[PDB]
Amino acid sequence: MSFCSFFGGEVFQNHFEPGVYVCAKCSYELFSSHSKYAHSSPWPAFTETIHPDSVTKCPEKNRPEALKVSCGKCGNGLGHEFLNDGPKRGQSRFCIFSSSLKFVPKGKEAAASQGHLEHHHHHH
Ligand SMILES: [Zn+2]
């Protein structure tokens, strides 16, 4: 008699490491650094979005307290915003499918910090 086993029940607690989001169709890297925060929990979501020209949304009929959002460029439509329901709270936040867009993490960690070096100037 011996037997060996060790587990917690789920892997989820380490899903907070830094990265970027890219299209499920277009593969182009797009998310604003301000539209999501850092936490380790069930129910991952983002408070805001980048609001570009290349994605679009439409309201529900049968669910008139929420709306669906699509990648109208490539013609997707799997994410949502539960809009006008929550306006004082952290109620009304966007939620999306894994088949709507992908995750590309950083190397190990780093990120979420400042550093600037840029110049071009001429006169003749
Ligand atoms: Zn797309």
Swiss-Prot record:
GO terms for cellular component: cytoplasm; cytoskeleton; nucleus. It is found in: Cytoplasm; Nucleus; Cytoplasm, Cytoskeleton. The active site is at residue 95. Residues 1-106 form the MsrB domain. It is an enzyme of class 1 (oxidoreductase). Keywords: Cytoplasm, Cytoskeleton, Immunity, Innate immunity, Metal-binding, Nucleus, Oxidoreductase, Selenocysteine, Ubl conjugation, Zinc. Binds 1 zinc ion per subunit. GO terms for molecular function: actin binding; L-methionine-(R)-S-oxide reductase activity; peptide-methionine (R)-S-oxide reductase activity; zinc ion binding. Its EC number is 1.8.4.12, 1.8.4.14. InterPro entries: Met_Sox_Rdtase_MsrB_dom, MsrB_Met_sulfoxide_reductase, Mss4-like_sf. Zn(2+) binds at residues 23, 26, 71, 74. Its cofactor is Zn(2+). Truncated MSRB1/SEPX1 proteins produced by failed UGA/Sec decoding are ubiquitinated by the CRL2(FEM1C) E3 ubiquitin-protein ligase complex. It holds the Pfam family SelR. Its main location: cytoplasm. Belongs to the MsrB Met sulfoxide reductase family. PANTHER family: METHIONINE-R-SULFOXIDE REDUCTASE B1 (PTHR46755:SF5). Methionine-sulfoxide reductase that specifically reduces methionine (R)-sulfoxide back to methionine. While in many cases, methionine oxidation is the result of random oxidation following oxidative stress, methionine oxidation is also a post-translational modification that takes place on specific residue. Acts as a regulator of actin assembly by reducing methionine (R)-sulfoxide mediated by MICALs (MICAL1, MICAL2 or MICAL3) on actin, thereby promoting filament repolymerization. Plays a role in innate immunity by reducing oxidized actin, leading to actin repolymerization in macrophages. This is Methionine-R-sulfoxide reductase B1. It comes from Mus musculus (Mouse). The gene is Msrb1.
